[PDB]
Amino acid sequence: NYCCAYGEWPNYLPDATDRFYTLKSVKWETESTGWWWKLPDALNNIGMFGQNVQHHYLYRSGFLIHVQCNATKFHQGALLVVAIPEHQRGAHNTTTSPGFDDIMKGEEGGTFNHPYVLDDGTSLACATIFPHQWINLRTNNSATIVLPWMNAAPMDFPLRHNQWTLAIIPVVPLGTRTVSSMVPITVSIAPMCCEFNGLRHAI
Amino acid sequence: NYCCAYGEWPNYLPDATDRFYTLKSVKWETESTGWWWKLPDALNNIGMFGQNVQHHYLYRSGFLIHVQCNATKFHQGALLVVAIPEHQRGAHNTTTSPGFDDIMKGEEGGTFNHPYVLDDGTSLACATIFPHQWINLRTNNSATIVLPWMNAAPMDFPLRHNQWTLAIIPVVPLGTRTVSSMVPITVSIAPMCCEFNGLRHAI
Amino acid sequence: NYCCAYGEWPNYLPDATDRFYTLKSVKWETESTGWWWKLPDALNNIGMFGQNVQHHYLYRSGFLIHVQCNATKFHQGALLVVAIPEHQRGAHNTTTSPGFDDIMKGEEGGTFNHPYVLDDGTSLACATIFPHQWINLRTNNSATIVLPWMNAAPMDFPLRHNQWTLAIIPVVPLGTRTVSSMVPITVSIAPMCCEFNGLRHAI
Amino acid sequence: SETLVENFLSRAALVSKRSFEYKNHTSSEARTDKNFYKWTINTKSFVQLRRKLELFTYLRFDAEITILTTVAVGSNNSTYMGLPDLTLQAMFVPTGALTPEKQDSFHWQSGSNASVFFKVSDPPARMTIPFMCINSAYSVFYDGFAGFEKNGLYGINPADTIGNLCVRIVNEHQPIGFTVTVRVYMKPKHIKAWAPRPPRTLPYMSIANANYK
Amino acid sequence: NLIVPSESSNTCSLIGFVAAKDDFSLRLMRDSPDIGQL
Amino acid sequence: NLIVPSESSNTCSLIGFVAAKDDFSLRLMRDSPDIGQL
């Protein structure tokens, strides 16, 4: 079952690129901290939506997040799939603002440095206030999350703003007693109800 | 599904203590003979029902037996859960009547000495005439049994009489090839349709 | 669900022996090539149908094929169960026609020499044009196939003709990392809508 | 119909065969029968009818009692002489009521108790013991203790003790001794059976409990 | 053949049962040789 | 007791949650000691 963010279906702006852009699935280990993919930065460089990111100065898009954890039934682990609305990250023990390479991670996305505080000063223990599902391999092998337009501006630039941020976190680390084995995190994102205006040069 | 004893639901006497009193769950091993809990002697010392046992000279109660065998699906084993009506036990090779400590085992309950003859001279092979379910871990991980009032007297003393006797017996011993591992027997008893009269001193 | 051959239910001839004749179940290994049972040669010598084969010069029969692969859910493997209509086999690298003992294998049936070409010069990769099911142990532990009368002659001799030929082939070999363990192929055949005329001596 | 539980349990099986001796036992005896035997009515002394009645927990029935008494000559006399007549006052003692200790034991008048009169030269004594227990059925087992003390015996009911079927020689002693074999037959009529148990497999050793060996 | 996973129990087991249908009947009740006094 | 297969993970885990019902209410809003300036 889907868990549409705050109980509303995404739509066009009031008065093509819906392919499920499956990412390169990350290895989940026991020592895996967690992986975050900022949207649309996780899809800024891949696909026709990725070309629409460069070719348009402004954009709006919902995202149909689908995380797949193909596992044996003997495997153990629940990941918090949380789609943070507007995840301003932080760096540990520094007053410096985190730069381009710590945030603009591209299609592969960034790993989590200290995910217990969600790398932003908050707590992940409360981060279930978010759009959120569970991929507890006891019962749930695949979760999905529906994301509407999340920006105070109605329609803004993709290449210098992340509206949503996927974060797949092992709150419980993997268990199969061969430390860890297989279990990829197939994160597939479809930009649904996508709309692009401002036909300018491909930035 | 429940397996109410002889197809009748328990009720009050014709003309509060319904909390599921979960016991300390016993380790099921390959060499485990079986465990019997006499009722209300398994709940004589625990809970508000346990205090009602001492505080009242007479009592009547049905019991909603619920046995839980949380197991992996790779685990093997079926336990006869039989609620014996009025299990007069016996001792092997002795003519002496078994005493207090061999019967009044308290909340922990007694283990089975020779459970194949059900420790009473009968045969456990016929003991499926009883209120009975199966916790065969292939399909059934948790069984339950509904017990009405089982005494020829309409309402008698708890502290010197056991009406029912739970008996969880490994007819097939445990199999996980690490001899045995985890698998507790969470035996939870709720005294349902409980009634107590004869307000005397707490015996 | 059954997969009746080409979507038609078997019946009597237009103008007793329905017991499920379970065979001796073959060991499926990693190195198992595949096993074929020619019908009614797999049931020529067993049961009342087997005696009806000898006692009658002519016969007609449908067959309710049921293959059972009792396995753990951790086991791996899919077998092509294909009931070949009229499987004329061949031998590798010889121009000689294959004889009695290479075809009249009896109740045990024959193993496959080179099953990738289905031992007849065709390809097993196309052999899913056949009456066919899958016993992929991920989801399907037991498959069944319904076989009508398959002969150009309306009613012919059993002891010198095979109409159908079961072929259980490991397209994917067994996996349980203890090379292979248990997993029998319980092939049970019931001759349904059987009919026998020509009451002669038992051949 | 033949397999009905009323048809099943109503078989007159011998549960106490007491060949009690009829002689001046007041002369020199220590523990033995003094021309009377005190048998508590329990249906568990003979294992055929016992295992017939370990089939169920709770067994409410009207327990018909048939007493067949045969008087044989003693081996001390070693003479036949003919069978003399002897009427027997067969008393049932209910629970709580006192039991006699002699042949002329002052309880045989039975102001409250119920006793029947019959002769040896008369067909056997057929009466019907009322279902007298305080509980609504005969719990042949007791997973509990009769008293609230710790040393109370396990398996015994303070309510299902049927009584004491006490049979004496109301007549005086004979100079010639006679062994009177009193056979007790239980015909339980009006069977109200509850909650079947497995039939017993291992042999018994004690009448009171259900130990196994 | 019995096929079990390489992590599960190799020695599997099986339990039988008997009961009757509604058409069962009994006659000529007799004393069984299951038990006897000695 | 926790019973796990001999091939699966021995150290199992469990996660709690809290939320309220619809009857939750709050009054007298105050500055929390969770954070402070220094």
Contacts of E8 in chain F (CB under 8 A): 5-7
Residue C199, strand partner residues: C56
Quick one: how many helices (H) and strands (E) in chain C?
1, 10
Q: What's the CA gap between C159 and A176, in Å, rounded?
A: 55
H/E stretch holding E3: none
Contact indicator for C89, C120 with CB cutoff of 8 Å: yes
- Contacts for F23 with CB less than 8 Å, ≥ 6 apart: none
Contact indicator for D174, D84 with CB cutoff of 8 Å: yes
State whether residue B177 sits within 8 Å of chain C by CB: no
Q: What's the CA gap between C13 and C194, in Å, rounded?
A: 10
Q: How was this structure determined?
A: cryo-EM
Which of D60, D22, D46, D85 has its CA nearest to residue D184?
Answer: D46
Contacts of B119 in chain D (CB under 8 A): 212
Contacts of E10 in chain C (CB under 8 A): 181
State whether residue E31 sits within 8 Å of chain D by CB: yes
- Give, as one character, the DSSP assignment of residue B97: P
State whether residue B169 sits within 8 Å of chain D by CB: no
Contacts of D48 in chain E (CB under 8 A): 31, 35-37
Q: What does this entry list as its resolution, in Å?
A: 4.0
Q: How far is B180 from chain D (nearest CA, A)?
A: 30
Hey, are the CB atoms on F6 and E5 less than 8 Å from each other?
A: no
Cα-Cα-Cα-Cα dihedral sign, residues F6, F7, F10, F15: negative
Our answer on whether D and A touch (3+ beta-carbon pairs < 8 Å) is: no
Give the residue numbers in E contacting F (CB under 8 Å), as ranges. Answer: 5-8
Taking residue B80's Cβ as centre, other Cβ atoms within 10 Å add up to 23
Q: What's the CA gap between D57 and D77, in Å, rounded?
A: 48
Contacts of D55 in chain E (CB under 8 A): none
Taking residue B93's Cβ as centre, other Cβ atoms within 10 Å add up to 9
Our answer on whether D and F touch (3+ beta-carbon pairs < 8 Å) is: no
Mutation target vs D (from E23, E26, E35, E37; most D CBs, 10 A cutoff): E35
Contacts of A73 in chain C (CB under 8 A): 73
Which of B34, B50, B193 has its CA nearest to residue B109?
Answer: B34
DSSP sequence for chain A: ----GGG-----------S-EEPPPEEP-SS---EEEEETGGGSSSHHHHHHHHHEEEEEEEEEEEEEE---TT-B--EEEEEEES-----TT--SPP-STTT--TTS-EEPSSGGGTTTTS-GGGGGGSSEEE--TTT-SEEEEEE----SSSSB-STT--SEEEEEEESS--BSSSS----EEEEEEEEEEEEEEEE----
Hey, are the CB atoms on B76 and E13 less than 8 Å from each other?
A: yes
Contacts of A74 in chain C (CB under 8 A): 74
Our answer on whether E and F touch (3+ beta-carbon pairs < 8 Å) is: yes
Hey, are the CB atoms on D195 and B98 less than 8 Å from each other?
A: no
State whether residue F6 sits within 8 Å of chain A by CB: no
Which chains lie within 8 Å of chain C at 3 or more CB pairs, if any? Answer: A, B, E
Core vs surface per residue F1-38: b (16+ CB within 10 A) or e: eebbbbbbbeeeeeeeeeeeeeeeeeeeeeeeeeeeee
- List C residues 65-104 in contact with B (Cβ-Cβ < 8 A): 72-74
Hey, are the CB atoms on E1 and C75 less than 8 Å from each other?
A: no
- Give, as one character, the DSSP assignment of residue C24: P
Hey, are the CB atoms on E10 and B177 less than 8 Å from each other?
A: yes
3-state class of C144 per DSSP? Answer: strand
Q: What's the CA gap between D35 and D21, in Å, rounded?
A: 6
State whether residue A172 sits within 8 Å of chain F by CB: yes
Q: What's the CA gap between D152 and D144, in Å, rounded?
A: 9
- Give, as one character, the DSSP assignment of residue C42: G
**Edge to edge, what strands does the sheet with A110-111 contain?**
A110-111, A35-39, A164-170, A79-85, A132-134
DSSP alpha helix (H) spans, chain B: 47-55
State whether residue E20 sits within 8 Å of chain D by CB: no
Q: What's the CA gap between C26 and C45, in Å, rounded?
A: 18
CA D199 to chain centroid, in Å, comes to 23
Please name the residue that has the structure tokens 């509604």. Answer: E22
Q: Which residue of A has its CA nearest to C76?
A: A72
Which chains lie within 8 Å of chain D at 3 or more CB pairs, if any? Answer: B, E
Our answer on whether D and C touch (3+ beta-carbon pairs < 8 Å) is: no
Contact indicator for B90, B113 with CB cutoff of 8 Å: no
Which of F5, B136, F4 has its CA nearest to residue E7?
Answer: F5
Q: How far is C145 from chain A (nearest CA, A)?
A: 30
Contacts of F13 in chain A (CB under 8 A): 76, 172, 175
Contact indicator for B59, B158 with CB cutoff of 8 Å: yes
Q: What's the CA gap between D147 and D150, in Å, rounded?
A: 8
State whether residue B71 sits within 8 Å of chain F by CB: yes
Contact indicator for A59, A193 with CB cutoff of 8 Å: no
Contacts of B73 in chain F (CB under 8 A): 5
Which of A201, A70, A64, A85 has its CA nearest to residue A146?
Answer: A64
Contacts of B73 in chain A (CB under 8 A): 73
Our answer on whether F and A touch (3+ beta-carbon pairs < 8 Å) is: yes
3-class SS letters over chain D: CCCCHHHHHCCCEEEEEEEEEECCCCCCCCCCCCCEEEEECCCCCCHHHHHHHCCEEEEEEEEEEEEEEEEEECCCCCCCCCCCCCEEEEEEECCCCCCCCCCCCCCCCCCCCEEEEEECCCCCEEEEECCCCCCCCEECCCCEECCCCCCCCECCCCCCCCCEEEEECCCCCCCCCEEEEEEEEEEEEEEEEEEECCCCCCCCCCCCCCCEC
Hey, are the CB atoms on F5 and E8 less than 8 Å from each other?
A: yes
Contact indicator for A150, A6 with CB cutoff of 8 Å: no
Taking residue C152's Cβ as centre, other Cβ atoms within 10 Å add up to 7
Contacts of C73 in chain B (CB under 8 A): 73
Which of D60, D6, D37 has its CA nearest to residue D184?
Answer: D37
- Retrieve residue C20's tokens: 């499920």
- Retrieve residue D55's tokens: 């089939």
Which of B60, B39, B38 has its CA nearest to residue B153?
Answer: B60
Contact indicator for D193, D139 with CB cutoff of 8 Å: no
Residue B32, Cβ density class (10 Å: 0-12 exposed, 13-18 middle, ≥19 buried): buried
- Retrieve residue B128's tokens: 């499926």
H/E stretch holding B78: none
Q: What's the CA gap between B54 and C104, in Å, rounded?
A: 80
| Phi-psi region at A55: left, alpha or beta (left = phi > 0; alpha = psi -120 to 50) | alpha
Partner residue facing F15 (CB), from A76, A78, A176: A78
State whether residue C51 sits within 8 Å of chain E by CB: no
Q: Which residue of F has its CA nearest to B76?
A: F5
3-state class of B7 per DSSP? Answer: helix
